[PDB]
Amino acid sequence: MQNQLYIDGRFVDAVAGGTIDVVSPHDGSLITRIAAAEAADVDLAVAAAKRAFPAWSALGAAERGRLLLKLADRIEECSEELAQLESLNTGHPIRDSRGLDVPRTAACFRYFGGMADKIEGSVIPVDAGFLNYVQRKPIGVVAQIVPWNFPLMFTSWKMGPALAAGNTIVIKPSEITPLSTLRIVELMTEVGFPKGVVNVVPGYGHTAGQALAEHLDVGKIAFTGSTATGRRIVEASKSNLKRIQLELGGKGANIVFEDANIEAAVNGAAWAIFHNQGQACIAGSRLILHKDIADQFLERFIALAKSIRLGDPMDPETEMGPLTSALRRDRVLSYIDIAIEQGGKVLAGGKAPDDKALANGFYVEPTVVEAKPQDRVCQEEVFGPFVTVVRFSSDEEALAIANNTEYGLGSGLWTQNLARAHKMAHAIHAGMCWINCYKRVSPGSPFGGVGQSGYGREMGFEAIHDYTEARSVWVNVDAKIAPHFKR
Amino acid sequence: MQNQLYIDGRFVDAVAGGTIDVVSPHDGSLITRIAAAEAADVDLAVAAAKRAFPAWSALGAAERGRLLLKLADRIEECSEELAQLESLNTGHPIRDSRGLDVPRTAACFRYFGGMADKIEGSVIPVDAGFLNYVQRKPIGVVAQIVPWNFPLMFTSWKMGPALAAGNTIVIKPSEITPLSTLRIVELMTEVGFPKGVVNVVPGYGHTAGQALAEHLDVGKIAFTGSTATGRRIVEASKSNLKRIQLELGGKGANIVFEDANIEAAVNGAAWAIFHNQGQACIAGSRLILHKDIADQFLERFIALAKSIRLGDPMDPETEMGPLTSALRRDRVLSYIDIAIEQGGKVLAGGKAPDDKALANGFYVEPTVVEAKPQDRVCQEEVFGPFVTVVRFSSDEEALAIANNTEYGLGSGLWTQNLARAHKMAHAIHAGMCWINCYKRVSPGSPFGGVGQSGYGREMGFEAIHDYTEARSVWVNVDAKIAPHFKR
Numbered sequence A, B: 001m002q003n004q005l006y007i008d009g010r011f012v013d014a015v016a017g018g019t020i021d022v023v024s025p026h027d028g029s030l031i032t033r034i035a036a037a038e039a040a041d042v043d044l045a046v047a048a049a050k051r052a053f054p055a056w057s058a059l060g061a062a063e064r065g066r067l068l069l070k071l072a073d074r075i076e077e078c079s080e081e082l083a084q085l086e087s088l089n090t091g092h093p094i095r096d097s098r099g100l101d102v103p104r105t106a107a108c109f110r111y112f113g114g115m116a117d118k119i120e121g122s123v124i125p126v127d128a129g130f131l132n133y134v135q136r137k138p139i140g141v142v143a144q145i146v147p148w149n150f151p152l153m154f155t156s157w158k159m160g161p162a163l164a165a166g167n168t169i170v171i172k173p174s175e176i177t178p179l180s181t182l183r184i185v186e187l188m189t190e191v192g193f194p195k196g197v198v199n200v201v202p203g204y205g206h207t208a209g210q211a212l213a214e215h216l217d218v219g220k221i222a223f224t225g226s227t228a229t230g231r232r233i234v235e236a237s238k239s240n241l242k243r244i245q246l247e248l249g250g251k252g253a254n255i256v257f258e259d260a261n262i263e264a265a266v267n268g269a270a271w272a273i274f275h276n277q278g279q280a281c282i283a284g285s286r287l288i289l290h291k292d293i294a295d296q297f298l299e300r301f302i303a304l305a306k307s308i309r310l311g312d313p314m315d316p317e318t319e320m321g322p323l324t325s326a327l328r329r330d331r332v333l334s335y336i337d338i339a340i341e342q343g344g345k346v347l348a349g350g351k352a353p354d355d356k357a358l359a360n361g362f363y364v365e366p367t368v369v370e371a372k373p374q375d376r377v378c379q380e381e382v383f384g385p386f387v388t389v390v391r392f393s394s395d396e397e398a399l400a401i402a403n404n405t406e407y408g409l410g411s412g413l414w415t416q417n418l419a420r421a422h423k424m425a426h427a428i429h430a431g432m433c434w435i436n437c438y439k440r441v442s443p444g445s446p447f448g449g450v451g452q453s454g455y456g457r458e459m460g461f462e463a464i465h466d467y468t469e470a471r472s473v474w475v476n477v478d479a480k481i482a483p484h485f486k487r
């Protein structure tokens, strides 16, 4: 439905009339045309935000909170309208859009609604006679850039904290999946959000994206994307030394020890990499199995893989859908051919679906490939339904395999040994680690990377901190200075 | 005195024999020759640090704490030895090195010594049957770069937090003022700090400094310097997306209202800009006086300015010394000539004093210049004993003046009106604001900039947070999720 820029509370076309095609991943069909934002457009969106900020941040915190709260209830009223718009644009089964994407986007906004007035300053114990209080205040206009894997969920992950804190926002979704988030802004002002407090500006990365990260009135830039692109954001920020949050990606590891609950681990590991058609940043795209249970696991796992109802996203009975862009699909498939050239033994799937109906879309089937570590495809992020299997025999060997990546966003492990579980989670260099479960998120629990998967967290009290400055104020009440320059 | 690199617990020469002259700002005399660190040298210092990290962070926190605590006591034992070494190298009057520089360096280390085992993780309220605890862990190798205005104090400001947190350090002081901090590392290992846990690598900005910010094993780079140089640090960090802390400087404002206590304000304002020969970032290099008290203030202020015992840093009766480098002296003086070309009326000092002994050192005398805002010298940081005076008539005009800068790091204001004091401190865009006092710091009270004076704080619980990652661990104890892919 909606498809234009949203600047200062009005849906407007791109200043230079720019346009971008938004396609359905299921049949290649055109869904609609997006107003394509360019430098001149963001200049406006940011100016709109800059203008709206003083009044917005001047609102009592409780008020910003109440609006977020209503937005959350409102998103649930339009539960189906949204789940449908999203799954259509991204290829997410409605199985997911209805039960995950939407409720978790609302739950997140609700969290931060209840958060806005619980952000407290502090009073520092200090020299006698002085009073040092430190206020925690909004940074200013905040620029946010997201990818296209959870377009809907990201709106809550990203704007949720920034808004509660009192910041004013300019957000550029994925030229590939803007539709979802455009409806959200409408829902915002429907619920009472002042004009200009939020501004959506879909557009190419090197136009909208770059113009945004470079902008001189933008006080912080919050980016979720690839390591490659993260560097172009860092470069951009040097213009006015704006703060940065980097949510780059990772090759999440998924270890299964000898004493694991094979059934639960197969189901977890399958949900881990295959849910959301493998386009999860936290996706366990590296399996790591103990020798003694490796065979027994793959028997049950591969079976499960081949029996996955893959098809039309709009089918309530569809378990897995297509990749969200034609490009990627391509990419992935080349990553598969590559894994074979290095001696990979493809154990399930491996190419596009046989079906005539299926090949109108960017589909690829559940792929599992046996390999060695230090292989090219066990290092670089294959952003698809693609799992590599390796085997280990000692705890220490498993840790070594899990840490031999330049990526450390997420990882998990399956055991029933008290010591082993905690020892491992402590040793693995990763921003988060799941035991006997996987891909569990929750607003309030810090979500972010470590090292080359970036800095800054989303979700928690941590998230709020990232969107807030510290004004320190000293008041001399009862302490009398003795002149430094003694008369 | 002590003059070589310090890498892996040994004083060593630069790998390529490089050398740098360290001069006394009082007479131009040579003090000694510093081993000049270059790329190859930091490669070692960082490797030493990377190696020492595992063991160091593995120590119980309380242990790291105890060492910091002893280092603080030890620094006070060598109180004079250091105050003397510092004031000699920097031109800081001893009266200042003895009573300020040294005790505040110890105090800060002592703070963070008591802090190391009070850094707590958190346990998140989460879905029933799960247990989500979030540990707060060290980053790894931390690189720190400092300027030359408080060489001694910075060692505590910077390494204090980083070490307590469990990080391992590689620090590049100011080629111009390395001596002070070299002694400190010796003191560290004297007190029991493992070899490699701290590494000092004095050297040129574009050799040591650049190689350090670019290094791929460095997990965070903490920089204190100029806005100009800050951008080169941001560029460098794109190599491995290392975290950044920036403390670029600022043109601190110092407002005096009609109802001020004008004696106390003259003494504060004088201490503000002239203490430490004006080479304070937080230095009030912009006076702002109400019409009704402007004249009366300057009468008392200018008198005080001209009556400032300016001379030999080693004289216990010296009130103000030289600038720490010949290049600054020269820049500065040019900034003075500039203020005149724009119609500035120099009210006190204005050129190099013309004394005998002082004709050899990089001296400049207390300068006060009447001007208008928007003038070139009221915008750019004159890093010297240099105050510009402007006048205002309404509160609102004063705020406008104080905010018309790119910089936002130091502000102060003098009033006795409850409302005015708080309203103002809340409106001024600055990371910290002092009322009826100035340049008051304290470990525990966050010290940092806002906007183009950078991000990140030193000195507080905040400071600890900037030197620490968040590992989130999920444990499934009583969870029986339906398999996502329903059989």
Ligand SMILES: NC(=O)c1ccc[n+]([C@@H]2O[C@H](COP(=O)([O-])OP(=O)(O)OC[C@H]3O[C@@H](n4cnc5c(N)ncnc54)[C@H](O)[C@@H]3O)[C@@H](O)[C@H]2O)c1
Residues within 6 Å of the ligand: A145, A146, A147, A148, A149, A150, A172, A173, A174, A175, A203, A204, A205, A206, A208, A209, A210, A213, A224, A225, A226, A227, A229, A230, A232, A233, A246, A247, A248, A249, A250, A280, A281, A381, A383, A409, A448, A449
């Ligand atoms: N850390 C997390 O929580 C998290 C969550 C979801 C996805 N991801 C990561 O997202 C990635 C997928 O997205 P991608 O393949 O399109 O990478 P990408 O960096 O090219 O695209 C991401 C977004 O940034 C914008 N962009 C592209 N180039 C830009 C530029 N030069 N300047 C400014 N902005 C620009 C795009 O328009 C887009 O919407 C993965 O590698 C994955 O791991 C991370």
Ligand SMILES: NC(=O)c1ccc[n+]([C@@H]2O[C@H](COP(=O)([O-])OP(=O)(O)OC[C@H]3O[C@@H](n4cnc5c(N)ncnc54)[C@H](O)[C@@H]3O)[C@@H](O)[C@H]2O)c1
Residues within 6 Å of the ligand: B145, B146, B147, B148, B149, B172, B173, B174, B175, B203, B204, B205, B206, B208, B209, B210, B211, B213, B224, B225, B226, B227, B229, B230, B232, B233, B247, B248, B249, B250, B280, B281, B282, B381, B383, B409, B448, B449, B453
């Ligand atoms: N915000 C604060 O807490 C704070 C505290 C003290 C000083 N300051 C600011 O610091 C300034 C003084 O420093 P400056 O005039 O010598 O400029 P500067 O930034 O060049 O010098 C400071 C340090 O930066 C390092 N450095 C320089 N060039 C580098 C490069 N190309 N790559 C990596 N590292 C490099 C140097 O080797 C040096 O020791 C002031 O303007 C002042 O207000 C800010």
